[PDB]
Ligand binder design. Structure first.
Ligand SMILES: [K+]
Ligand SMILES: [K+]
Ligand SMILES: [K+]
Ligand SMILES: [K+]
Ligand SMILES: [K+]
Ligand SMILES: [K+]
Ligand SMILES: [Mg+2]
Ligand SMILES: [Mg+2]
Ligand SMILES: [Mg+2]
Ligand SMILES: [Mg+2]
Ligand SMILES: [Mg+2]
Ligand SMILES: [Mg+2]
Ligand SMILES: [Mg+2]
Ligand SMILES: [Mg+2]
Ligand SMILES: [Mg+2]
Ligand SMILES: [Mg+2]
Ligand SMILES: [Mg+2]
Ligand SMILES: [Mg+2]
Ligand SMILES: [Mg+2]
Ligand SMILES: [Mg+2]
Ligand SMILES: [Mg+2]
Ligand SMILES: [Mg+2]
Ligand SMILES: [Mg+2]
Ligand SMILES: [Mg+2]
Ligand SMILES: [Mg+2]
Ligand SMILES: [Mg+2]
Ligand SMILES: [Mg+2]
Ligand SMILES: [Mg+2]
Ligand SMILES: [Mg+2]
Ligand SMILES: [Zn+2]
Lengths: 60, 155, 127, 125, 80, 98, 24
RNA sequence: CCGGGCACUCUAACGGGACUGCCCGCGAAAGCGGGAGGAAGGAGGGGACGACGUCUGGUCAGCAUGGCCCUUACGGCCUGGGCGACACACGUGCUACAAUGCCCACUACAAAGCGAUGCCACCCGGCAACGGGGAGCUAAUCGCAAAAAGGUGGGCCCAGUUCGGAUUGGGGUCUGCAACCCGACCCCAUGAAGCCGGAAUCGCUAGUAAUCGCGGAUCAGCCAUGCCGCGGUGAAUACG
């Protein structure tokens, strides 16, 4: 997550397409789940801390 | 099977002849788990054993399986220097497993264009002492006995 | 008047109501050989009767939903066996051996990760 | 009997047979026997001289086939090349022409595999 | 089996720049960075230098070239 | 007859505070359609444990949304009293109609 | 088989619809 | 389908039950063998869970951080190209080489999930992709939807074929500012190699392998045959 790149936040991307998501917590581009705004890593860390409401360790 | 002795599986007897041996053969004929299509085949072929024979198919079937059972087979075993093909008795269960495996195998080597025909003719030809399967059974038996010189490696 | 045993198999539920009569079995409306037929298996679902020696004494209205036909074929094997228990309980002493009363726990094993199908593991070279 | 161009299908379903024609697929076949009331299932050799005519009449005039088609295709590719088109250059040296990877595969367009010497010191595995 | 739809695309940087060179002549050379623009009639005769990601290549345009994109004549990769 | 639907992540913050909106309606209104279950909407997240490669680890995470019904037959204006504003659930959301 | 773009299985496998696999 | 009713299925919440308790034998004991009852036994089946430590293991390009280095540029914006290059070589996979098969038609049983500028019923135009119109749905109440293999009927008749769909030509739909480089999709035409694979080598012990299709995450679209899941059908074999 280079800073000049966290420019993403741009309601004015110029073209809706260029509008890519990023991790709300790290800036991580890839594996950025939509239901959380977080990335694949952050999602696991926080879920472990209990800060993700409802989120639980699934087993079946 | 390092720990146990591995018990044998039991199979639901045939939905017709009410025989387990039949189901065994059915499963060997099976493929990709299509047990329905598999069952059909044995049955159609089972019918074709009649109107070609005045005998009951089951008696035919059960005696083919019999002539294909090998009473001796050669197994390997390294004894410093190389591997010696050692002949030895074949257990009652492997005989059956081998016999059936061989029938489906020879059957499918036949030229007859459709399955049921192939199983049928192989069943028959086998019943009277000829056919791919019996050939195999005899090549095997000939293998053993052809290595009597290594009989003292019992095991 | 009536008898009813449930019966389940591999995620299939079967309602089996046995009612004195000829012996014509129904399944979701369709005749027995109408919901099945073409399935050499089916015949076995009515084995519960044959064992106790029923058949010519009971008719059967059956409901079936969930999974696949061969599964249903087995759930029904319990219905006709559980309902056949409410009728005469001295029958349980004849289906115990046959095991028609035993529910079949065998079910699809979960698909694990790293693997391709729960157990089928991916292949490697090592060179 | 002989239809479209110097070709003659035979002893087998007219639809299947019409397939041996160049520009005639399996769809064009179903249509021709359709717009010509001929039963597709009939074995060519059992066709009426009247049917063969009504059949020939249609196919011949309604589509470009055999020598004709090849001359066109051959013609199009030639044009692509003649106009410095990228798609042309691919044809220029028989390499995939539809955005396909060429690091691996592309054997049908490249043909037999021409192996050479390489660096085995590095696990190219 | 190519496609675009019902509204053929062409970048207006030249769409009008090119047509203007017709309003009073024809001119010489042109420099574009839109290898994505379709080629249309009014371009024939002209000579446009398309960018191959590195330079501007002198692409002469002929009648039998309309419909194709400019990039198709400015190869990006240098090989053997 | 008031359609009630209780959703939540906790199977006690609902199942329980779903009897408060039933008992506080048993004696002030009809008999109520009692508390009705309703299947759950399990949303799974499968992610790679490690931060780099090792894609054969994973570890699973679910966020299951439980649901409840209730339904109070006879829009008893006398039931609307006990209810209205008297509960204890913090992790719940209600959707109700007539 | 599943690879034939112009067949039923061809469309099923490729998840699409069309002439060879109508949307009923 | 309506009245109607919650017995049944089911939905989701609590709880019951299995303990070698229960019977014969061996045993010093633990426990082992066998049976009875029971849906289930002896760890019933599958998960979550992985010690002290090891490999100067992997990641400073997720994030954090010491040191070091660049600070009209090793920072920044942008247009375009590249990550998609192709004489070659390997890994993992997909689809196959076919008759236990392929095709067309008709007919039947699933589970788990997703759905507001979203899933899209039904209707009309189009061979079709899709386009126009438009009902319902805050979704056990509507949609994705067909499950496929299967069953029934017909066709093909052993052929590189009605096997197999590569490659290439043409026309067109769609998402997106824009599909040349470099998208998927439909339709016509083309119709390749492949006849079951050398040495060598991988997986799997039961509802598993094998086989069949279904959903989702990311996502405008998609190069997913990948990945994480679901259920249908359902083996062989283990002396040792
Ligand atoms: K492995
Ligand atoms: K080739
Ligand atoms: K296949
Ligand atoms: K357990
Ligand atoms: K270390
Ligand atoms: K093989
Ligand atoms: Mg940083
Ligand atoms: Mg994007
Ligand atoms: Mg993103
Ligand atoms: Mg499965
Ligand atoms: Mg042709
Ligand atoms: Mg390329
Ligand atoms: Mg084909
Ligand atoms: Mg097909
Ligand atoms: Mg004891
Ligand atoms: Mg003793
Ligand atoms: Mg533990
Ligand atoms: Mg190191
Ligand atoms: Mg390193
Ligand atoms: Mg790359
Ligand atoms: Mg491979
Ligand atoms: Mg229409
Ligand atoms: Mg047929
Ligand atoms: Mg072909
Ligand atoms: Mg062949
Ligand atoms: Mg392997
Ligand atoms: Mg997607
Ligand atoms: Mg691609
Ligand atoms: Mg898929
Ligand atoms: Zn992050």
């Amino acid at each position: 997550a280079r800073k000049a790149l966290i420019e993403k936040a741009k309601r004015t991307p110029k073209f809706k397409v260029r509008a890519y998501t990023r991790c709300v917590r790290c800036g991580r581009a890839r594996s950025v789940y939509r239901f959380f705004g977080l990335c694949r890593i952050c999602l696991r860390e926080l879920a472990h801390k209990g800060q993700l409401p409802g989120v639980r360790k699934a087993s079946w | 099977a390092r720990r146990r002795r591995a018990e044998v599986r039991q199979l639901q007897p045939d939905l017709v002849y009410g025989d387990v041996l039949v189901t065994a053969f059915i499963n060997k004929i099976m493929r990709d788990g299509k047990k329905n299509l598999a069952a059909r085949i044995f049955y159609d072929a089972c019918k074709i054993i009649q109107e070609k024979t005045g005998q009951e198919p089951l008696k035919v079937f059960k005696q083919a399986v019999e002539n294909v059972k090998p009473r001796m087979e050669v197994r390997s075993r390294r004894v410093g220097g190389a591997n010696y093909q050692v002949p030895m008795e074949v257990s009652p269960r492997r005989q059956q497993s081998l016999a059936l495996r061989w029938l489906v195998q020879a059957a499918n080597q036949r030229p007859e264009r459709r399955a049921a025909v192939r199983i049928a003719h192989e069943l028959m030809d086998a019943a009277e002492g000829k056919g791919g399967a019996v050939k195999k059974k005899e090549d095997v038996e000939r293998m053993a006995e052809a290595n009597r010189a290594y009989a003292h490696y019992r095991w | 008047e009536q008898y009813y045993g449930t019966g389940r198999r591999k995620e299939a539920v079967a309602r089996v109501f046995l009612r004195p009569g000829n012996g014509k079995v129904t399944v979701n409306g369709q005749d027995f050989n109408e919901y099945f037929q073409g399935l050499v298996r089916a015949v076995a679902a009515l084995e519960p009767l044959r064992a106790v020696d029923a058949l010519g004494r009971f008719d059967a209205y059956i409901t079936v939903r969930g999974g696949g036909k061969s599964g249903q074929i087995d759930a029904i094997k319990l219905g006709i066996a559980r309902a056949l228990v409410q009728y005469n309980p001295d029958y349980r002493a004849k289906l115990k051996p046959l095991g028609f009363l035993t529910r079949d726990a065998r079910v699809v094993e979960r698909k694990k990760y790293g693997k391709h199908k729960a157990r089928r593991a991916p292949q490697y070279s090592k060179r | 009997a002989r239809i479209a161009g110097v070709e003659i299908p035979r002893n087998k379903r007219v639809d299947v047979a019409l397939t041996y024609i160049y520009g005639i697929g399996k769809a064009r076949a179903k249509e021709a026997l359709e717009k010509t009331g001929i039963n597709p299932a009939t074995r060519v050799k059992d066709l009426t001289e009247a049917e063969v005519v009504r059949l020939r009449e249609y196919v011949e005039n309604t589509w470009k086939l055999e020598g004709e088609l090849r001359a066109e295709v051959a013609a199009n590719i030639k044009r692509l090349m003649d106009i410095g088109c990228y798609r042309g250059l691919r044809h220029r040296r028989g390499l995939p022409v539809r955005g396909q990877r060429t690091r691996t595969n592309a054997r049908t367009r490249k043909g037999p595999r021409k192996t050479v010497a390489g660096k085995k010191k590095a696990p190219r595995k | 089996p190519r496609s675009l739809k019902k509204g053929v695309f062409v970048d207006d940087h030249l769409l009008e720049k090119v047509l203007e060179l017709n309003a009073k002549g024809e001119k010489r050379l042109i420099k574009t960075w839109s290898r994505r623009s379709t080629i249309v009639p009014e371009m024939v005769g002209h000579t446009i230098a398309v960018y191959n990601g590195k330079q501007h290549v002198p692409v002469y345009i002929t009648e039998n070239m309309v419909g194709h994109k400019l990039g198709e004549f400015a190869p990006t990769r240098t090989y053997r | 007859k008031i359609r009630i639907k209780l959703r939540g992540f906790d199977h006690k913050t609902l199942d329980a505070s779903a009897q408060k909106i039933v008992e506080a309606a048993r004696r002030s209104g009809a008999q109520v359609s009692g508390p009705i279950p309703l299947p759950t909407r399990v949303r799974r997240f499968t992610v790679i444990r490690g931060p780099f490669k090792h894609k054969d680890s994973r570890e699973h995470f679910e966020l299951r949304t439980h649901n409840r019904l209730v339904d109070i037959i006879n829009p008893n204006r006398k039931t609307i009293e006990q209810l209205m504003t008297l509960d204890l659930p913090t992790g719940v959301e209600i959707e109700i109609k007539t | 088989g599943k690879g034939d773009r112009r067949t039923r299985r061809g469309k099923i496998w490729r998840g699409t619809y069309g002439k060879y696999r109508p949307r009923k």
